[PDB]
């Protein structure tokens, strides 16, 4: 069936896009909260799939699978807050940001089944674009290829309550692309990725698209 | 879309309107209960938004997010009682008020998902009014601008059971305005608020509506 | 709206009609069960409301709010049995009565949300009557005004299991009157109540229906 | 209403038909399982009701109310297996019988609300019969009145898991007769029952159907 | 009724197809995960039933009944991942395989009721075949009768979380055949099975299809 090769089926399925960890005390948790900016170019697997196209438009479904680091669940009340683009992100475990009515928040117990929410098409432009041959502001670093109109928002996680939580939390964020539309197909990345924000490739070790053989007649 | 600028969308979304805390023993809890009169002029954020209009009419949806102070949940049975206007409020952890059939009460376990209830348009007048240029009873303090026809009711929280609860409770009250209607738009508050019940402003430090610059030509 | 003054709205709302307590061991609990005969003339508040009419007919909805005496809930299996009129009531924590198919019983865990059940119009007569100027069998005590055709049934509560429960239980019984019909309105009780089963009033201290004043002209 | 005297209403309502107890260790539980053959002639109350008719046909609804002996519930996974007639019953806590696809089994946690299942009309004959004036194979004991075509099946209870359960279990089995049909009404048992499988009565102490009085004129 | 002898009814009902055990530490669990390739020829009971036909086509419903080895349940988050045919299976408790979007995974708590999922008809051929009189690649062992087009997939179980789970898990996998279709009926296996992948039988001890008797006239 040709349905299997349709843009939609190719970009369906919820995949893991991030793994936030909030230990009781260690390196980055005397805070008590986390700010994860929604990022797709996170996993090279999904990134390569997207960079097959120049422009894309879609909705995103997020599912929040949390539990303690060993898999155990406890009666802990959590809060996930979506900070749209152009909005101020929490800077402390108790910033005013957490009370701002305009930053939709979802409250759920770690015992309750995973929370699920859908985020629309945020760009101010007609489509997200993985490639911008210009500057949003010149030969050159910093400020090139960067298109801020792809900014999808930020998710701020934290345990509820005035005192810090006794439990460490390991949260897995899954995302599913709904209603996909793609434009202008381009060559498939054949060089290892070096950065999230640009096509730079290792220029000394340029790998060949295909494996080799001895003679052009041996097969 | 113009829908985004519609009165309804502007006043939608559930925001935090109050944070009640009932510790086992400290300052105000050898009682075991709390009486929160429904108050909107609580958070200056929402208050400024309302004082953009003279009269407003609407329904209110209340959601009760509770848990212990650190975010943990325990099998504690709670009772939230709505004491309408003109009704007697509980004066002790065990007043008759808690048994009065006419004071609707909702019983829920701290484990159960947040309780949610809708309160109608209580005023005896056609609309709530954030400004009353008269007296409900004269140059002058006390008894001015005060309109008792805006009184929306009181919520009385307490743990159920004859003995006091072993757990401390931190309850967050969220409110959402439904079916909003507004009349007679007025200037937007440009001076810091000094009191909940009146427009008094600091008259020595009168802030300018806009920032300044050197010359009227430098830009 | 006149709807607010309608017999139905006047007698709606679930009110507390009884508070049964079953401690592990104290005065009346080496038993392990309780027999509460359904009684409305329990709370003078609701009683006065009913004695505004001579005859009344209605269905009753019962809700069972239970928890330990301090409000905590535990995984305890309880059984509530309705013993109709003319049926034999349990006389021990393990009478045959608890197994009698004809005594409908509802089993629920103290963790599960409150059990709710509806009891119909039990009287063998066309309506319940709060006043019977005769004898069911003469100037006179005992056997007067007593109409057994108002007998609505009994509720027998107990913890399930062959051994006694480790936990103390405090159960609140709420009742709501559905489909109300009233006949022959009568004067409103103006003297304090002395007994559940009769209009006897303190005859030495007869209180006046209204407060007093000095002169009939001072106001 | 005549509806109350209808065969259906007379045989409705779920009654207790059995009480299985599986202690950790005592007399009959170093096993870890129980085999209860579905038996109606268990409780003389229901038995007398059935023997008012010669033939009966009906479906049966079974509800499984379990908990520890004191009424407490714990996170124990149980398995109830229905072994139809002509099928092999488990002979050990781990017989192959428990894995046989054809023996429908229902898995439920003691925390989950009571399991409920419906068993159809199993007899190979058109109706169950409480009386068979013949032999299924002669004056005489053993092998008389016994009709094996009334065999409804067996229920095998056990805790899941390879190791024995730490908890003792007391399970109450309730049964409700659905879609009842009865034929050929007969005299009502007036002598105490002596056995489950036959009408034998104590012949020395033959009780009179009615109480006595002195003279045939005194009343 | 002939419905009882229909291919569908004959192959219905969920039966146990596998019992995976993941102890904290013992022989095969310092790993923390398990890879069970979906196998029907597991239980000789069901296998014999299938080998009554040459070709079969059907969907499969899998139910995952898990709990600790003694039947107790704990708040443990588990993950069941379906690795289709031609896909790479996890090789460690934390392989990339567990993050691969294309390997559908279902997350469920051991407290939640058993997870249930349906797997379609995976073969690249029109039907699964329990007999292939050829080679997929000759008199002869290894590489005969083996048809890889019957490969249905693999299920990879594991506890979620970065650290190993404190609890041992015993998981029972039930399978139900939906929408069955069978072709070309063949003789029923009358010799004990020796291997999962071939009809080899013990040739010294060849058992007779029927029991014996003395004379051909004694009955």
| The CA-based dihedral angle spanning residues C92, C98, C99, C103, taken in that order and rounded to the nearest 10 degrees | 140
End-to-end CA distance of chain C: 32
Q: CB C54: neighbour CB atoms within 10 A? A: 16
Give the three-state DSSP class for A147.
coil
Task: Name, in order, each residue with C-beta under 8 angstroms of D114's C-beta and a sequence gap of 6 or more.
Answer: C107, D63, D64, D65, D66
User: Distance of CA B154 to CAs B18, B35, B82, B123, B128, Å?
Assistant: 12, 7, 6, 14, 16
Set of chain C residues whose Cβ sits within 8 Å of the Cβ of D74? 75
For A35, the token pair is: 């700010």
Which helix (H) or strand (E) is D44 found in, with range? helix D44-50
Q: CB E160 to CB A67 under 8 A? A: yes
Separation in Å, CA of D13 to nearest CA in chain C: 6
CB E171 within 8 Å of CB E65: yes
Paired with E77 in beta bridges are E109
* Pairwise CA distance, residues B60 & B177, whole Å: 5
Paired with B187 in beta bridges are none
Set of chain E residues whose Cβ sits within 8 Å of the Cβ of A42? none
Q: CB A44: neighbour CB atoms within 10 A? A: 13
Q: CB E169: neighbour CB atoms within 10 A? A: 23
The DSSP string of E27-57 is SS-SS-EEEEE--STTSHHHHHHHTTEEEEE
Only one residue has tokens 């539980």, namely D29
Give the three-state DSSP class for A48.
helix
* Pairwise CA distance, residues E93 & E35, whole Å: 11
Q: Which of residues 83-122 of E touch D (CB under 8 A)?
A: 111, 113-114
Q: CB D121: neighbour CB atoms within 10 A? A: 16
* Pairwise CA distance, residues A165 & A159, whole Å: 6
Contacts 24+ apart (CB under 8 A), E81-85: E81/E105, E81/E106, E81/E155, E81/E156, E81/E157, E81/E158, E82/E117, E82/E119, E82/E153, E82/E154, E82/E155, E82/E156, E83/E35, E83/E153, E83/E154, E83/E155, E83/E156, E84/E122, E84/E153, E85/E122, E85/E151, E85/E152, E85/E153
Q: CB D183: neighbour CB atoms within 10 A? A: 12
For C13, the closest chain B residue by CA position comes to: B101
Residues counted in chain C: 219
* Pairwise CA distance, residues B209 & B191, whole Å: 8
Separation in Å, CA of A1 to nearest CA in chain B: 40
* Pairwise CA distance, residues C105 & C82, whole Å: 6
CB B40 within 8 Å of CB B153: no
Contacts 24+ apart (CB under 8 A), C82-90: C82/C117, C82/C119, C82/C153, C82/C154, C82/C155, C82/C156, C83/C35, C83/C153, C83/C154, C83/C155, C83/C156, C84/C122, C84/C153, C85/C122, C85/C151, C85/C152, C85/C153, C89/C35, C89/C154, C89/C156, C90/C33, C90/C35, C90/C156, C90/C158
The answer to whether E123 faces chain A, any CB pair under 8 Å, is: no
Chain mean position to CA C44: 11
**Nearest-CB residue to D71 (from C99, C102, C160):** C160
Only one residue has tokens 């003469």, namely C138
* Pairwise CA distance, residues C108 & D73, whole Å: 11
User: Distance of CA A176 to CAs B141, C93, E88, Å?
Assistant: 61, 57, 22
Q: CB D13 to CB C101 under 8 A? A: yes
Only one residue has tokens 């508070």, namely C19
For E68, the token pair is: 């600790």
The DSSP string of chain C is -GGGGSHHHHT-S-EEEEEEEE-SSSSS-SS-EEEEE--STTSHHHHHHHTTEEEEEEEEEEEEEEE-TTSB---BEEEEEEE-TTSPPP-STT-GGGG-TTS-EEEEESSS--EEEEE----SSSSEES--SS-----SSSSSS--GGG---EEEEEE-SSSPPSS-EEEEEEEEEEEEEEEEE-----S----SS-----SSS---SS---SSSS--
Q: CB D76 to CB E71 under 8 A? A: yes
- Chains that contact D by 3+ CB pairs under 8 Å? C, E
For B75, the token pair is: 């099998």
Only one residue has tokens 């080899």, namely E200
Give the three-state DSSP class for A72.
strand
Q: Which of E78, E67, E91, E83 is nearest to E19 (CA)?
A: E67
Q: CB A69 to CB E99 under 8 A? A: no
* Pairwise CA distance, residues A167 & C218, whole Å: 72
CB B34 within 8 Å of CB B157: yes
Separation in Å, CA of B166 to nearest CA in chain C: 8
Instruction: Kindly tell me the burial class for residue D144, based on how many C-beta atoms sit within 10 Å of its own C-beta (0-12, 13-18, 19 or more).
Output: middle
CB C60 within 8 Å of CB C116: no
Instruction: Compute the half-sphere exposure of residue A133: CA atoms within 13 Å on the CB side of its CA.
Output: 2
Task: Name, in order, each residue with C-beta under 8 angstroms of A203's C-beta and a sequence gap of 6 or more.
Answer: none
b (16+ CB within 10 A) / e for A101-125: bebebebbbbbeebbeeebebbbee
Only one residue has tokens 């407290």, namely E111
User: Distance of CA A217 to CAs A209, A210, A213, Å?
Assistant: 19, 16, 9
Separation in Å, CA of C71 to nearest CA in chain B: 5
CB E17 within 8 Å of CB E55: no
Handedness of CA D192, D194, D199, D202 (dihedral sign): negative
* Pairwise CA distance, residues E115 & A72, whole Å: 18
The answer to whether B73 faces chain A, any CB pair under 8 Å, is: yes
CB E8 within 8 Å of CB E180: yes
E-strand ranges in chain E read 15-22, 33-37, 53-67, 77-83, 105-109, 115-119, 128-129, 154-159, 169-185
Set of chain B residues whose Cβ sits within 8 Å of the Cβ of A107? 65, 114
Separation in Å, CA of B100 to nearest CA in chain A: 32
Q: Which of A133, D113, E30 is nearest to C107 (CA)?
A: D113
The answer to whether C65 faces chain B, any CB pair under 8 Å, is: yes
Separation in Å, CA of D62 to nearest CA in chain C: 14
For A120, the token pair is: 């629309």
Local structure of residue E5 (DSSP, 8 states): G
CB B36 within 8 Å of CB B18: yes
The answer to whether C75 faces chain B, any CB pair under 8 Å, is: no
Only one residue has tokens 């139900």, namely E176
CB D103 within 8 Å of CB D82: yes
- This entry's atomic model was obtained through cryo-EM
Q: Which of A198, A192, A83 is nearest to A146 (CA)?
A: A198
CB D17 within 8 Å of CB D165: no
End-to-end CA distance of chain A: 32
Set of chain B residues whose Cβ sits within 8 Å of the Cβ of C21? 162
Set of chain E residues whose Cβ sits within 8 Å of the Cβ of A21? 162
* Pairwise CA distance, residues C126 & C149, whole Å: 10
CB D57 within 8 Å of CB D125: no
Q: Which of D94, D59, D60 is nearest to D79 (CA)?
A: D94
Which helix (H) or strand (E) is D6 found in, with range? none
- Do β-strands D105-109 and C154-159 pair in parallel, antiparallel, or remain unpaired? unpaired
For D203, the token pair is: 């012949």
For D173, the closest chain C residue by CA position comes to: C99
CB C10 within 8 Å of CB C50: no
* Pairwise CA distance, residues B89 & B156, whole Å: 8
* Pairwise CA distance, residues B21 & B169, whole Å: 6
Domains and CATH numbers, chain C: 1-219 (2.60.120.20)
Chains E and A make contact, 3+ CB pairs within 8 Å: yes
CB A85 within 8 Å of CB A152: yes
Set of chain E residues whose Cβ sits within 8 Å of the Cβ of D107? 65, 114
Q: CB A45 to CB E101 under 8 A? A: yes
CB B64 within 8 Å of CB B173: yes
* Pairwise CA distance, residues D14 & D16, whole Å: 7
Handedness of CA C137, C141, C146, C152 (dihedral sign): negative
- What's phi and psi for D117, nearest 5 deg? -150, 150
* Pairwise CA distance, residues D123 & D107, whole Å: 26
For C121, the token pair is: 């119009």
Only one residue has tokens 């039990």, namely C122
CB D169 within 8 Å of CB D159: yes
Q: Which of A173, A187, A174, A204 is nearest to A22 (CA)?
A: A173
Separation in Å, CA of B56 to nearest CA in chain C: 22
Phi-psi region of D201 (alpha: psi -120 to 50; beta: other; left: phi over 0): beta
Q: CB D170 to CB C164 under 8 A? A: no
For chain E, the helix, strand and coil percentages under 3-state DSSP, each to the nearest 5: 10, 35, 55
Give the three-state DSSP class for D21.
strand
Q: CB D70 to CB C101 under 8 A? A: no
The answer to whether B14 faces chain A, any CB pair under 8 Å, is: yes
For chain D, the helix, strand and coil percentages under 3-state DSSP, each to the nearest 5: 10, 35, 55
* Pairwise CA distance, residues D60 & D178, whole Å: 6
* Pairwise CA distance, residues A36 & A20, whole Å: 8
Which helix (H) or strand (E) is E209 found in, with range? none
CA angle D42, D46, D51 (to 5 degrees): 100
Handedness of CA A179, A185, A190, A194 (dihedral sign): negative
Q: CB D170 to CB C162 under 8 A? A: yes
């Amino acid at each position: 069936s040709t349905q299997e090769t349709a843009i939609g089926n190719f970009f369906s399925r919820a995949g893991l896009v991030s793994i936030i960890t909030m230990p009781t005390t260690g390196t980055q948790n005397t805070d008590g909260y986390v700010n994860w900016d929604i990022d797709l170019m996170g996993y090279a697997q999904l990134r390569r799939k997207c960079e097959l196209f120049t422009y894309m438009r879609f909705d995103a479904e997020f599912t929040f699978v949390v539990a303690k680091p060993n898999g155990e669940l406890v009666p802990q009340l959590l809060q996930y807050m979506y900070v749209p683009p152009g909005a101020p992100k929490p800077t402390s475990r108790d910033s005013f940001a957490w009370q701002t009515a305009t930053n939709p928040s979802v409250f759920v117990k770690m015992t309750d089944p995973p929370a699920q929410v859908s985020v629309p098409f945020m760009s101010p432009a007609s489509a997200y674009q993985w490639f911008y041959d210009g500057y949003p502001t010149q030969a050159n670093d910093l400020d090139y290829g960067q298109c801020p109109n792809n900014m999808m928002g930020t998710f701020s996680i934290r345990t509820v309550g005035i005192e810090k939580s006794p439990h460490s939390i390991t949260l897995r964020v899954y995302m599913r692309i709904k209603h996909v539309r793609a434009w202008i197909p381009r060559p498939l990345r054949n060089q290892p990725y070096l950065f999230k924000t640009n096509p730079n490739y290792k220029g000394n070790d340029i790998k060949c698209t295909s494996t080799s053989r001895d003679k052009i007649t041996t097969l």
